[PDB]
Design a protein around this ligand. Structure first.
Ligand SMILES: [Cl-]
Ligand SMILES: [Cl-]
Ligand SMILES: [Mg+2]
Ligand SMILES: [Mg+2]
Ligand SMILES: [Mg+2]
Ligand SMILES: [Mg+2]
Ligand SMILES: [Mg+2]
Ligand SMILES: [Mg+2]
Lengths: 112, 112
């Protein structure tokens, strides 16, 4: 429901441990823009989901465009954070992007 | 010289950012036992050396056996420490190991 935020999932990757990053924001699953999105950020996501370490951090909607709101932009994780929510970013819903820039991750546990 | 301790290096990894962990102790480069050695401990070493975050924390002398003293055992970093010296351990030179257990790290900055 609309009171709930701060869940994380990967979609459209064909595997539990890769795909487009989606973040729950006020009942809607939103996406993350690829601006400043890098393997440090992907590693927080991969570790948070128990998927190993980040092998790469694809941009440009490699795993498709989402249909929800764009909720995070210019994420600046160091790679050591325990939650994506802990990393610096632009502020929720503050972006300069479109869904052709939706960010993704490929984690080391893919396929296995 | 023999008065100096508390420097950190990785050796025998083929890259600056992976290898056997070695710790300077009274002028000699010593090793770390793999007992309780995990990715939280590796994360502290990797960040201390400017090598990023930890991919894994290999035990059992993956990067060979050292020849110096075994100086640290049962290291229990939380992951947040800025120095390996901050982490809980068994006490300097207090170990129940041999060099076939020398600990190593593999950090994200390994590159080709
Ligand atoms: Cl993991
Ligand atoms: Cl070691
Ligand atoms: Mg972009
Ligand atoms: Mg970033
Ligand atoms: Mg932007
Ligand atoms: Mg052991
Ligand atoms: Mg430990
Ligand atoms: Mg021991």
């Amino acid at each position: 429901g609309s009171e709930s935020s701060l869940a994380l999932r990967l979609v459209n990757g064909g595997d539990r441990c890769q795909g487009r990053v989606e973040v729950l924001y006020q009942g809607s699953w939103g996406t993350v823009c690829d601006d400043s999105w890098d393997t440090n950020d992907a590693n927080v996501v991969c570790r948070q989901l128990g998927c190993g370490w980040a092998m790469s951090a694809p941009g440009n909607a490699r795993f498709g465009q989402g249909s929800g709101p764009i909720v995070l932009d210019d994420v600046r994780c160091s790679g050591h954070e325990s939650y994506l929510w802990s990393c610096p970013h632009n502020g929720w819903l503050s972006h300069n992007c479109g869904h052709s820039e939706d960010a993704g991750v490929i984690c080391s546990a893919v396929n296995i």
